Design an enzyme around this catalytic site. Structure first.
Site, PDB file in Angstrom:
ATOM      1  N   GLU A 186       0.816  -1.202   0.000  1.00 32.91           N
ATOM      2  CA  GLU A 186       0.000   0.000   0.000  1.00 32.91           C
ATOM      3  C   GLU A 186       0.865   1.274   0.000  1.00 32.91           C
ATOM      4  OE1 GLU A 186      -0.122  -2.700   2.235  1.00 32.91           O
ATOM      5  OE2 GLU A 186      -2.152  -3.437   2.281  1.00 32.91           O
ATOM      6  N   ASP A 191      -3.429  12.500 -29.430  1.00 30.39           N
ATOM      7  CA  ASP A 191      -4.490  13.048 -28.595  1.00 30.39           C
ATOM      8  C   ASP A 191      -4.632  14.573 -28.743  1.00 30.39           C
ATOM      9  OD1 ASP A 191      -2.073  13.129 -27.178  1.00 30.39           O
ATOM     10  OD2 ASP A 191      -2.890  12.094 -25.392  1.00 30.39           O
ATOM     11  N   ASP A 200       2.678  14.767 -28.051  1.00 37.10           N
ATOM     12  CA  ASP A 200       1.442  14.317 -27.420  1.00 37.10           C
ATOM     13  C   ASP A 200       0.757  15.517 -26.745  1.00 37.10           C
ATOM     14  OD1 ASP A 200       0.060  13.269 -24.836  1.00 37.10           O
ATOM     15  OD2 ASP A 200       0.352  11.426 -25.897  1.00 37.10           O
ATOM     16  N   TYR A 250      -6.767   8.632 -28.320  1.00 35.19           N
ATOM     17  CA  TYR A 250      -7.812   7.749 -27.768  1.00 35.19           C
ATOM     18  C   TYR A 250      -9.131   7.778 -28.505  1.00 35.19           C
ATOM     19  CZ  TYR A 250      -4.345   8.048 -24.251  1.00 35.19           C
ATOM     20  OH  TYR A 250      -3.125   8.035 -23.610  1.00 35.19           O
ATOM     21  N   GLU A 283      -5.105   7.394 -11.562  1.00 39.42           N
ATOM     22  CA  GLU A 283      -5.935   7.027 -12.696  1.00 39.42           C
ATOM     23  C   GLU A 283      -5.306   5.902 -13.528  1.00 39.42           C
ATOM     24  OE1 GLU A 283      -3.926   8.898 -15.777  1.00 39.42           O
ATOM     25  OE2 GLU A 283      -3.082   7.933 -13.987  1.00 39.42           O
ATOM     26  N   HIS A 326       4.733   9.736 -19.128  1.00 37.21           N
ATOM     27  CA  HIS A 326       4.433  10.155 -17.770  1.00 37.21           C
ATOM     28  C   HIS A 326       5.224   9.392 -16.723  1.00 37.21           C
ATOM     29  CE1 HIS A 326       1.427  12.790 -19.270  1.00 37.21           C
ATOM     30  NE2 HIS A 326       0.718  11.807 -19.795  1.00 37.21           N
TER      31      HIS A 326
HETATM   32  N1  LIG Z   1      -5.789  10.892 -16.520  1.00 36.49           N
HETATM   33  C1  LIG Z   1      -5.248  11.596 -17.664  1.00 36.49           C
HETATM   34  C2  LIG Z   1      -4.303  10.651 -18.364  1.00 36.49           C
HETATM   35  C3  LIG Z   1      -3.904  11.134 -19.745  1.00 36.49           C
HETATM   36  C4  LIG Z   1      -2.676  10.342 -20.110  1.00 36.49           C
HETATM   37  C5  LIG Z   1      -2.243  10.537 -21.538  1.00 36.49           C
HETATM   38  O1  LIG Z   1      -2.969  10.399 -22.514  1.00 36.49           O
HETATM   39  N2  LIG Z   1      -0.988  10.912 -21.637  1.00 36.49           N
HETATM   40  O2  LIG Z   1      -0.355  11.136 -22.848  1.00 36.49           O
HETATM   41  K   LIG Z   2       3.673  16.888 -25.100  1.00 34.72           K
HETATM   42 ZN   LIG Z   3      -1.499  12.247 -24.057  1.00 35.53          ZN
END
Ligand SMILES: NCCCCC(=O)NO
Ligand SMILES: [K+]
Ligand SMILES: [Zn+2]
Ligand SMILES: NCCCCC(=O)NO
Ligand SMILES: [K+]
Ligand SMILES: [K+]
Ligand SMILES: [K+]
Ligand SMILES: [Zn+2]
Ligand SMILES: [Zn+2]
Ligand SMILES: [Zn+2]
Lengths: 341, 341
Positions: B106, B284, B195, B323, B117, B159
């Site tokens: 945890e 995206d 992105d 997406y 998320e 990320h």
């Molecule tokens: N919860 C938001 C996540 C977006 C992640 C994404 O598409 N990153 O490139």
């Molecule tokens: K970017």
């Molecule tokens: Zn993204």
């Protein structure tokens, strides 16, 4: 001793809590207050009064204004943004992040949150203000000369830090009570946090302050929520040096060990010269508590209350955690029996 | 140009994503790779090959070892602890926390996470390793003399920071590719992240390094995930001084504005003297992307690819986000048409 309790706790009745990767009904639910109130009355503590309402004067001295402004409108903004669930943070300002505050609701809820297992729901702010009011009225009784009072706070408070909510907490009721006592003329106050979990919020509020001594007994943060504060090495910074005392303890800890930490914490509080002690009382230290790993028995709560009151300074008992089982009420009432006996 | 793609991406097939206070089917789902692969083949890019497997030598130079060890066993430990859902962090090391690493699952999942998320599910580690392998093989092609290649990475990477997962990402594929190119003999490499979201993980990895220039065009962090990094003022620290360039842009941004930031980013990369550019390609930015607020059109992706390739230095295109609609494939294929044309 007077028991201060607001029926407006019921305005916090969240539908969901993120636990074990699922959205489940919250552990911190209205029935807790019902069961605790009934047990304290059964034990003879039936001088129950609603708090007077209070504004933000006291709380603005322990919580950040932007944080309180965020809580006041969070639900409205979340709903207006079109989200279908309750308001739950996902992104957090963790290691090596910018210190900047986002402008949108998604960014702000993360900025102002330390734990995603607490959802903001309609009525949360209003309930948190009522719980704060119970703590303030309790503090006022102590300031007026009473040697004990019980503020039946819900929602609880000790995980709420200067500018963060989490752990089922929004306004740090115990911090507000300590501040109220200072405002009423005390120079030195202690908060003794006996809930199973570290009062990371409380520690944060007073970490750099020398007017409030913070002591906590709790599950070791290496193995227990809140995970990221509560180590013994954290003794205070700046003006707060030497006035934080953490007593982390491990799995299965019984009263024979826990009470030794209690004794030591009270020695430290006495050496500091506290004029009153605000007790953050959670009964999640109980051997049957569903989310905790200590092994206190119901009779141990009487011993606990007697020992804390033998400090010989006035006590305000402020309700924190304790979950699941009917004995939560008995256990709280037993602390009060020890204080009053 | 060669397209590197592993069928092992489908080992990441998480059931849940925390979005809008609900647990919903993830946006970052296996069908994305199917849509993209089909569209790139339709556009004539049918030299599709699986990556060779790789060990950890390259990735250990950009990610923390404790972090990788955590990802390797996270699912097993979560399941062993008795939790019923997928593995989702709740508590985070936010402002004014201890730097200590917890020992339990945890605590550790929170310690190693920047965003709740993203659930860890069975197969996630294996899938992440396959995606990293695709990026490494793509880099090796550029190192060997190819002027373009496409690594169809899934899960995405940008990320994932030195020691944190989040935003659907676990291993920073683009960072691993840039490191691979340095290991193969390059002295200066750039990563250009187009992105919609800020590549906060990539920025973190190289923020204090002067061998990799990081440029990102993205939704303003005041209003867009990841929220806590990506401001224009962040230009690097220590050895990394002057080699991070962020171009935050607002709601509705179209190509006429976005392309100006692209031009500027490429001027910076050229002045830095990058020997190759790793393009973190998310589509995206598209006007129909369900979680993003830019307004690029499908033809804009051709312009984008042609402009980036006009740098005259070799490109590795590494797949990130995009997406919701089958047109994510057309959009990716269009970037490749611009590069190859
Ligand atoms: N919860 C938001 C996540 C977006 C992640 C994404 O598409 N990153 O490139
Ligand atoms: K970017
Ligand atoms: Zn993204
Ligand atoms: N999700 C962990 C919340 C712990 C709540 C609690 O009892 N704090 O004292
Ligand atoms: K405690
Ligand atoms: K203090
Ligand atoms: K850099
Ligand atoms: Zn009295
Ligand atoms: Zn507790
Ligand atoms: Zn070639």
């Amino acid at each position: 001793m007077r028991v201060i309790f607001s029926e407006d706790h019921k305005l916090r009745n969240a539908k969901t809590e993120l636990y074990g990767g699922e959205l489940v009904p919250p552990f911190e639910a209205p029935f807790r207050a019902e069961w605790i109130l009934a047990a304290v009355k059964e034990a003879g503590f039936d001088d129950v009064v609603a708090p007077a309402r209070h504004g933000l004067e006291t709380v603005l001295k322990v919580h950040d204004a932007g944080y309180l402004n965020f809580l006041e409108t969070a639900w409205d903004r979340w709903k207006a943004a079109g989200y279908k669930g309750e308001a739950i943070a996902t992104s957090f300002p963790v290691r090596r992040t910018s210190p900047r505050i986002p402008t949108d609701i998604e960014g702000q809820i993360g900025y102002y949150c330390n734990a995603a297992e607490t959802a903001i729901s309609p009525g949360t702010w209003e309930a948190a203000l009522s719980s704060m009011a119970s703590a303030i009225d309790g503090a006022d009784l102590i300031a007026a000369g009473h040697k004990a009072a019980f503020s039946l706070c819900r929602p609880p408070g000790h995980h709420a830090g200067i500018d963060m909510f989490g752990g089922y907490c929004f306004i740090n009721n115990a911090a507000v009570a300590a501040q109220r006592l200072l405002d009423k003329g005390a120079k030195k106050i202690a908060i003794l946090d006996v809930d199973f979990h570290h009062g990371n919020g409380t520690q944060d509020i007073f970490y750099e302050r020398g007017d409030v001594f913070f002591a906590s007994l709790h599950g070791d943060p290496a193995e227990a929520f809140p995970h990221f504060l509560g180590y013994a090495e954290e003794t205070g910074k700046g003006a707060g040096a030497g006035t934080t005392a953490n007593y982390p303890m491990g799995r299965g800890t019984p009263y024979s060990v826990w009470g030794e930490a209690l004794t030591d914490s009270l020695k430290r509080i006495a050496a500091f010269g506290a004029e009153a002690i605000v007790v953050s009382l959670g009964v999640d230290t109980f051997e049957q508590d569903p989310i905790s790993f200590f092994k206190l028995t119901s009779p141990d709560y009487i011993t606990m209350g007697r020992t804390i009151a033998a400090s010989g300074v006035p006590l305000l008992v402020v309700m924190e955690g304790g979950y699941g089982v009917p004995e939560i009420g008995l256990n709280v009432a037993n602390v009060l029996k020890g204080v009053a006996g």
